[PDB]
Write a protein that binds this ligand. Sequence first.
Ligand SMILES: [Mg+2]
Ligand SMILES: [Mg+2]
Lengths: 727, 733
Amino acid sequence: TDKERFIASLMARMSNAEKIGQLRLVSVGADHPKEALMADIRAGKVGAIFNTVTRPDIRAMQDQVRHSRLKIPLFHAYDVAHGHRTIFPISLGLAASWDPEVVARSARISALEASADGLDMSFSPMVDITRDARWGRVSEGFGEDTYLTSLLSGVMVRAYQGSNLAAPDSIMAAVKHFALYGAAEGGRDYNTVDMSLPRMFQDYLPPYKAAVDAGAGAVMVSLNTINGVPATANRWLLTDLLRQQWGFKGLTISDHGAVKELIKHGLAGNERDATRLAIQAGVDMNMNDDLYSTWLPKLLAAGEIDQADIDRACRDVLAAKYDLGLFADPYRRLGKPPPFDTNAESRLHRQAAREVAREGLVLLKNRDGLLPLKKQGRIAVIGPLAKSQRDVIGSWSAAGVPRQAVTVYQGLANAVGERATLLYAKGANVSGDQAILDYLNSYNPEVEVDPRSAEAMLEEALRTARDADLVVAVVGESQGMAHEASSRTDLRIPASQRRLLKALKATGKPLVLVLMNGRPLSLGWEQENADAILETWFSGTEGGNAIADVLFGEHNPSGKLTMSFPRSVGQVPVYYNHLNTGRPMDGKYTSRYFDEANGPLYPFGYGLSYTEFSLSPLRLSSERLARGATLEARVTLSNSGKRAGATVVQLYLQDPVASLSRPVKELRGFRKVMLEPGESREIVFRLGEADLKFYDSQLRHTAEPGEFKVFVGLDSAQTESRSFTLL
Amino acid sequence: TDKERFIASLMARMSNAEKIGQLRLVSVGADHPKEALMADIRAGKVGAIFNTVTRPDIRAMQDQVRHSRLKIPLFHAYDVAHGHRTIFPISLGLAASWDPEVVARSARISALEASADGLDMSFSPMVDITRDARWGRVSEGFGEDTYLTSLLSGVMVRAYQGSNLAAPDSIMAAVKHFALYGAAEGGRDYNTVDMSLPRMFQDYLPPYKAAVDAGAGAVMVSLNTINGVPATANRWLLTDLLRQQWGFKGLTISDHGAVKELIKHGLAGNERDATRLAIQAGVDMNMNDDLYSTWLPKLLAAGEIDQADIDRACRDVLAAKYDLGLFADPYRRLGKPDDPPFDTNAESRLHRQAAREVAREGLVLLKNRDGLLPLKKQGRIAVIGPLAKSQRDVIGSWSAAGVPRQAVTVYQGLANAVGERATLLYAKGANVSGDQAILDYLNSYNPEVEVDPRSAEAMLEEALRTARDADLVVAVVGESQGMAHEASSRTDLRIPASQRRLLKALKATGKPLVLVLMNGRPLSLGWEQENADAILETWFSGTEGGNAIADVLFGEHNPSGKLTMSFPRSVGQVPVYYNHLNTGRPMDHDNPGKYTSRYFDEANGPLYPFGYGLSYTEFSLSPLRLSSERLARGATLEARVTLSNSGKRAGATVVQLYLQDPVASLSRPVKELRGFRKVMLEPGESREIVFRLGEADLKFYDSQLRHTAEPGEFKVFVGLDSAQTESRSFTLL
Ligand SMILES: [Mg+2]
Ligand SMILES: [Mg+2]
């Protein structure tokens, strides 16, 4: 109770002006010039800063606080999504590791590097469920599965915050985006979200609850409407659910201009009413638009808000700073009153980035064991992503320096050394569409546009392929194609690069596709025509080295998809945990399309190996399960091939008769197992009542007696099943 | 209460076997051979028949009733969706008329022809809201707008049922598909529907309620889950909402095998449990799977259902037969035993004048560069494309008793128009699809698509030869009717690739290129909008389609059709609809930034918006004027505008009134249709349009489902489409 007494005694001494100042979250920029901001900090008008990311800059801002009456320290936040300076694979690629220890390592190193630069908080993890591949922000989440995303949500929060939020190598997690942000209609960023309460509670909300239960200090509120109500004005979401049902005791933070955006949503006619709706809904901290500082005094004096609205918000800010240790030592992450190079090579974590990046790479095709490659012969390395440092570190690359990143080309060159001969040709620009190139280059030069014609680049690539034994085509999206507000109407590799691929195929040379992308892609032609396909997402600062490690067989690919790959954008959404319908497709009068093959091209949990694995028959510990008892599902996994390697044994559950139509299967467990040739492991899954419960039409959360079907396999599509009955 | 006394007295006489027999709805088929069915009718084991559609066949079934103990008459139902024998345009084309009197005429004639063949009931109107162009059944509805679909829902029900359901020219309407069937996830037929209650009540449910309020005798229950619960097992939907809140007093009917499908949905492990769920939810009549007849006796004897469950269902069936006049005369729609035999399909029994006049009204002019249309009837006209000579496709999907051989193709309509004055040159140009797997699908069950066995190249060279020998090209392209049918969901909204290759080759001849589109859903037409000289949307225009299309192409009728569903630029933009929410970061002309709600790889917004359609004349609207700046509760205000024909040809257009509630307790749509007026004007003629608005127009369902109009600003928009408007505001007190 030291914390409650400290905050009560401080707040008893604060003016409303001082309490309102604590709610203000700003960045140095056009709207807040540095010297005016310094003056506001000295006056106690600023609660926190984002987007200031070096120790001397952060220390300088904290120094201004000694001029305010109460000297309440700032906290400093940043978007450390998948690395701070050492960039790990994007989250969608981290998820493909199926290894909470790998994901925890990326988060722990991110927090170590961020805190070493003086940051206290990250706007991460992003834990929104994504079933729509068009949305640019699918790169930031962990895929489509509620169970896996919820597990990794808690893993990220614990890895960031550690055993103690006051530790100088801990940062506070601000879990985002609360809530349902990835259900945007049409996959258009910021668009309308409309869903039933059972779907919301069963499928979309659990990853946010998992973050709260892992002790997340902060929640960042989403930009979207939920069933007509913007999250930023949603008292049900932020008060009734988050605080009163889930027991969240931390800090709610608006997104950038989100309070002011209530006017565009048509919830408010003016900034005064927008401010009232946000503070009364339960938004504590106001990012950038300064509406709280502008309007809260007038709102209170007019009796339009209560003192308790200000006091709740201010208490939450002070409680976060308290937990971060900033009242004990506001410089605990900023060292003592020797300068250093923030971007020194010595401050990076290349070993960790390379080991983590290996685990997320997904082998999608490997005809006649073309991979792994031998380090010999003439290897053509062709495509616009082969030499791209900007793209390998992905979207939301924080303080990542492209020039420090290892490209696919450089990774191959490092791997072969003097062996083999690499032949480079760019082959195509990332896009043939000038309006797309101008969008991607609209703010910063993100995409190198080769001034040569497409035809000249193609002729050069064909000459290179002719001079080679095999072709490694490095193709896909630029990182700006899978970013905030970068929604796509087409899930294929860009047309300029597909023209290149078809030309390379026509040479007859063995064709290896290395894909870079931040979302599921439509790969029908590639699955038919490529000899091998390696999904590399955006693999980060050591991406090229991790990719070469897999291509030459130093690492046996072990990644498995956490999001279904649709055959085309016209099939969206496709996800493994769908309902059966009354007329399931297995034949015209079924739930299907007629103009394309049905189901995903690659299902949830899919990924190949350089070795072969066998599963023994699934055995359940009983055919009947008593209430409050545990069931064991056992299988033996064996490495039946010639190479050491890992795979992921997946356990799915179906409730085939229920008060609601339940999914054809739902992930309830998994085990990643590394085996030498001829090794076995007995895998034991534990199932309890908590695994069997679901939200019905009235949101009763219970398990109904009846049959459950247990499936075990190496992907969602290739399983063996046994049933038991819950009594 | 003379009706309820008649029904109470009859039910007092009936065994549970006889009561359960009334709930059985069957068709002659593999599962129910004709002679087995005849024996079941004689035993009182059949309540009703569907898909028996000629007087002699229906008379023969009614004749078996004489042999049962209680002699309770059958009713006979069919899918009379957009015509019985005289086929009108599909519903999406009827909607494009924006004319309740045109839609009423199609429904009245349908009921006239169906009842003349002895039918008592149609499984129509289909009134599901459709915002997803991929769904095959978009052709069957009225488009994306709740106001227009709700208005046409009531119009269809009143036109079918007339002033008296016992009239021999009336049929009962079984409104479908209750509910939300058109929101199928992925646009995959029968798929999961998941939506918020405020969206359900504001946008999707009103067309079903409009049908109930117009006095629809029946409701057909949908095949989909609603928020996890199949409609067929949904007590909230069928009892709490339909009966208790809406006061529906008629008959609920299952879809084909829908009760048994509760097992596949995973609500039941067996047929006994599926039967219990459906009857207790409020499904009265069991279509084809015979689960009610198989399981209701065992369920009642085990105390798993109540006698009241059987009694309610049986009462609903008997009340429908009573309203249809079938207890007063079971032969009232079947003439007299003295009546001589006749040809069911005689020309004399068709209504071609009504089909031709109605089909004219739904045709949408999408493009007309430099006034190419209307055409002069002279010179050499190449008529090219796989739909040019298609009788099967012009009558559309759900063509009921329509006879393809009686239909007027686009080619034949052009031949009828030009006579000796011009020379038509025909070439097929391409098959409807170049994809053999698609042709295999379309010829599954019934061979419906003529396949030219020649190579695509040979057909293209023939079409190019034909175009070269002509003064202009009329390309008749789009979907076959099997592409926009039940379970025909598309992943591509473009004209098929084989026909797009044909159009690109035709464009390269430099001949003027006129596109006549046939289709049952919005199409992606980016290339066509850029490259065609003119584009006429004809949907599937029915038995007189080719004549109505020629009437427009040669300027006998000035196109007046307007879209009721937004045409997306590509399938990757689905869904696109006009009454969307603004978001916090809108992308529009006034908000064109990078960090907005938009795609980056394609132009944004629909290619053609809701309410869009061109004319051969030009129209002007005067400034919008409101009768007051303030509206008191209990009062009406008037929005006034003058429409003028400022061109040289007579023609109609549609003035559209939209409302926005710019500040509300939930985010409200950027615009919502609240009125319209279709006006025919001579050149230089003007019409003062007066729209009436009240509190009823201003209400929405909030998060607690209170249906309220909040004080504050309302914006009134008037224009000739949803994208070309101006606004004036008033304040509700
Ligand atoms: Mg169960
Ligand atoms: Mg309002």
